[PDB]
Amino acid sequence: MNASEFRRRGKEMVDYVANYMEGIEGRQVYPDVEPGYLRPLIPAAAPQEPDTFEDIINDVEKIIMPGVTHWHSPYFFAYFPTASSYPAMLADMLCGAIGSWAASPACTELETVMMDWLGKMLELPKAFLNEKAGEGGGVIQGSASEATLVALLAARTKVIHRLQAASPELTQAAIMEKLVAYSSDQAHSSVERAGLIGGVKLKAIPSDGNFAMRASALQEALERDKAAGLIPFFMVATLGTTTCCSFDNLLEVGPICNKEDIWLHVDAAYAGSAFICPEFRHLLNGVEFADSFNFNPHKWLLVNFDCSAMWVKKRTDLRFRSLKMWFVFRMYGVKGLQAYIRKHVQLSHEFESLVRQDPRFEICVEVILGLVCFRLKGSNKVNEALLQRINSAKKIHLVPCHLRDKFVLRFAICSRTVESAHVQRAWEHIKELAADVLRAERE
Amino acid sequence: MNASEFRRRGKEMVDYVANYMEGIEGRQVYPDVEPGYLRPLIPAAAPQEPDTFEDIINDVEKIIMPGVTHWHSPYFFAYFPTASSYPAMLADMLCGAIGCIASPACTELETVMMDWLGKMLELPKAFLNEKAGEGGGVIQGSASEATLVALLAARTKVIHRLQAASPELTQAAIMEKLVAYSSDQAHSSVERAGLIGGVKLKAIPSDGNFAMRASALQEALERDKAAGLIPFFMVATLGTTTCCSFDNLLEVGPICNKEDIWLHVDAAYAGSAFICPEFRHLLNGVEFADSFNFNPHKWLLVNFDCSAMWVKKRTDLRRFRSLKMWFVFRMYGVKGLQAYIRKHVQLSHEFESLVRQDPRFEICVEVILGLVCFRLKGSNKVNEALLQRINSAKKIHLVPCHLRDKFVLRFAICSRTVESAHVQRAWEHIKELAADVLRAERE
Ligand SMILES: Cc1ncc(COP(=O)(O)O)c(C=O)c1O
Ligand SMILES: [Cl-]
Numbered sequence A: 001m002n003a004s005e006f007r008r009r010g011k012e013m014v015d016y017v018a019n020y021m022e023g024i025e026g027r028q029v030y031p032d033v034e035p036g037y038l039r040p041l042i043p044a045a046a047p048q049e050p051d052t053f054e055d056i057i058n059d060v061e062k063i064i065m066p067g068v069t070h071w072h073s074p075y076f077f078a079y080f081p082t083a084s085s086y087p088a089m090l091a092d093m094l095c096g097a098i099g100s101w102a103a104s105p106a107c108t109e110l111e112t113v114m115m116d117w118l119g120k121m122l123e124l125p126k127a128f129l130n131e132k133a134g135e136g137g138g139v140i141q142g143s144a145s146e147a148t149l150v151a152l153l154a155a156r157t158k159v160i161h162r163l164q165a166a167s168p169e170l171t172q173a174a175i176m177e178k179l180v181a182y183s184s185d186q187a188h189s190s191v192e193r194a195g196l197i198g199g200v201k202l203k204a205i206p207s208d209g210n211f212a213m214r215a216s217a218l219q220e221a222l223e224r225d226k227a228a229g230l231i232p233f234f235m236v237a238t239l240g241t242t243t244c245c246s247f248d249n250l251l252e253v254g255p256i257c258n259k260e261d262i263w264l265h266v267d268a269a270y271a272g273s274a275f276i277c278p279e280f281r282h283l284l285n286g287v288e289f290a291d292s293f294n295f296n297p298h299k300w301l302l303v304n305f306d307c308s309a310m311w312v313k314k315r316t317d318l319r320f321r322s323l324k325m326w327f328v329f330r331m332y333g334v335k336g337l338q339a340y341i342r343k344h345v346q347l348s349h350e351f352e353s354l355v356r357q358d359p360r361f362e363i364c365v366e367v368i369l370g371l372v373c374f375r376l377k378g379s380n381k382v383n384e385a386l387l388q389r390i391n392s393a394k395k396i397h398l399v400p401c402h403l404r405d406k407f408v409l410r411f412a413i414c415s416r417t418v419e420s421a422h423v424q425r426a427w428e429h430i431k432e433l434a435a436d437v438l439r440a441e442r443e
Numbered sequence B: 001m002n003a004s005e006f007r008r009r010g011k012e013m014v015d016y017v018a019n020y021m022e023g024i025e026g027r028q029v030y031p032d033v034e035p036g037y038l039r040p041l042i043p044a045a046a047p048q049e050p051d052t053f054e055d056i057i058n059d060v061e062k063i064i065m066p067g068v069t070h071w072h073s074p075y076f077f078a079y080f081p082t083a084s085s086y087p088a089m090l091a092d093m094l095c096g097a098i099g100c101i102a103s104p105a106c107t108e109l110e111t112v113m114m115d116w117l118g119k120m121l122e123l124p125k126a127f128l129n130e131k132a133g134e135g136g137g138v139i140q141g142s143a144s145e146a147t148l149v150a151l152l153a154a155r156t157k158v159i160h161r162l163q164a165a166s167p168e169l170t171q172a173a174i175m176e177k178l179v180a181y182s183s184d185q186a187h188s189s190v191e192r193a194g195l196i197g198g199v200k201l202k203a204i205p206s207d208g209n210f211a212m213r214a215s216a217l218q219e220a221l222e223r224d225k226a227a228g229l230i231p232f233f234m235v236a237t238l239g240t241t242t243c244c245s246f247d248n249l250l251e252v253g254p255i256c257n258k259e260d261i262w263l264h265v266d267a268a269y270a271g272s273a274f275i276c277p278e279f280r281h282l283l284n285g286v287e288f289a290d291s292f293n294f295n296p297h298k299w300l301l302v303n304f305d306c307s308a309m310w311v312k313k314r315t316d317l318r319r320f321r322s323l324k325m326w327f328v329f330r331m332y333g334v335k336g337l338q339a340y341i342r343k344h345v346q347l348s349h350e351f352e353s354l355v356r357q358d359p360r361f362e363i364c365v366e367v368i369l370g371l372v373c374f375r376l377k378g379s380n381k382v383n384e385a386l387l388q389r390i391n392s393a394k395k396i397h398l399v400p401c402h403l404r405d406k407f408v409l410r411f412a413i414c415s416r417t418v419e420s421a422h423v424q425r426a427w428e429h430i431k432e433l434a435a436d437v438l439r440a441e442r443e
């Protein structure tokens, strides 16, 4: 098609897309249609002459939509990794119209500036800023896995140089066999992968009663290891774990890392975004000690998933993406974005209220942000039974996890469209299915 | 923002983009901006309250446009890794709204579209799976990835096979001896696949027309089997990166078969043109192939992230890519697509015959489809000069290569809206600068 066909069909498409997102409340969260349904609804060969736009869209409603998930609804109470905000979509259109530094000076420079915005919003130390400070800095990464790996390699290179300076005798290989890294029991898969790929031993630290790393468990691990002739060099402290919103106590853990020459990497998961709100900055106290800090802004800052933001204390140790950051930051403002997290935290606590009022259910971890870790009091069996009925019903979606050896229902309020109405109706449904599940238990 | 706001601003973006595409001749393809220009133009921190869309789009024109490479320009006469068509743009809007990366319609629309495109290319039924056939097609992220998935597939096959015969043989001992091959003109992607796959890669010498022939291949194989190595993988290229030459698939196919070597046919650029009867013959021999791959996003107007690959045996073997195809096929129709291809071939021939009409220039390689390999008669040095004026004048832009020892100017016609008139203006500009380059030679 030409340009002015596009102005029309494009505007038409903005309309279709808007509608979708407005009435998404109605759609069923899971497709209620089976593998195999599609082949016979569509011609066996491609059309020779062009079909109408009119006819294609109808086909998307009638043929494609039923077979689609609809992760963008308020009733999908799990993190939806590939969601996108409206400003992200606007950018995404322009980002595709355009299509190294030399190739695109705007792409690169905007990266450097947007990281600064992000840095200031979170109120990270000044040292972390790319504002020409000549020290520290920040860069975008594809995955939080990449970041964890970069910090690790950097930490590894660093300890090797230090240890070989002390004793010129030792071999690089000799040192590597002895290197240990640490993370909390609730550390993300992306840490295991980092150490696997980086060629060092990874050990979990026992977390406390609230699933946080508390030093005493850290110090012990260090004593056990230093004396078996191993060498701690690197550690990930998690802020906002993926199992529950658990925060590793940075104030206890950092001072140890400094003393023991351990490199402190802070994996702020998705939670990091919350530090643009003052109520949460105390969870970040201790960042002073950390050598690197990583988080994914996507979940709470509405930016693109493609982006994992990461800073370092010293720059020397170490897709058109900043455009979407720019749009989203500019179209919500800090206060808008704050308003946003703040709304979800409140809906999360509204849900929590509901769970405390039903004596059949217990809450497992302190609710800090959007996620609520809750379960039915009893055996794991009972609860596995329940999550099955919730999914079977295809009305809402929840994902579980284990905590120690306990099966836990995660209720996650992340979606853009969520209101308390939805939480209200969601609770009740869960409530009704528990009733049904509970009868069964007695048989 | 909210839905009703997306409506207003989604449609404003739709215009902005059409405007950009209509005025794209005005733009200078390559940005000429001084390092560090962006920062003084963007505020030090994020805004607290939202900015205006007017102010945000104004900034795109002023701040972002000058720092971008306008790939879609008709005057950018090299291959453009992103082929953005309007109906591609429309599906992105939709994929955007139904976040994808589980749903019956991802997998099925994929299979169906792969039989559509397979039928269009007149592939052997063995590669299509609609008559219950065991073969079929999957869409990959890039040819680089598709080639690696094929290599690894072969490596597994061959390892399972030799170990079926000899249970005392270890994966380790077999890998040492594994050889794969491709044309001395084959795309780097192959090199990277052997490295990750950890096998030896060897280049087969091409002939007078930069084709891989039977003679040279079989020479290679005997040399390597006699050394006690193991051929397992073989890449044949249809449409080389260098001069668009075609490996002789009919010659090489049968050799791979009786030598029990996995045959992967890579057609990344030129595969699309096999939807035209005129060109389908170059693909004869696929029958012998084990896996066939090419990139439609290159020349079939699908947006960039989309590489298509069929295999004879699926058991040998992220984004919702099949929707972008479905849009593009339905909105162009087969006749519309074939038209798009034949346009580019034609302009390619228009250019070729302007270069012949001039006694100062030679054609280097047979001009098969859409790329022209030309040269000013005399020394490489005269020709390095000429490219250095073109690339300097900033009007149009060309990427050279070497053909054996000859320095060659490539001229790719590949962009949604190159027309006859662009070609001539371009050729006029080449001749001006050449008569200049020839004046220098006299001095
Ligand atoms: C011959 C050949 N092989 C492989 C590739 C890689 O294609 P892609 O950019 O999709 O990875 C190309 C160009 O894209 C090519 O021309
Ligand atoms: Cl979170």
Ligand SMILES: [Cl-]
Residues within 6 Å of the ligand: A276, A277, A278
């Ligand atoms: Cl504040």
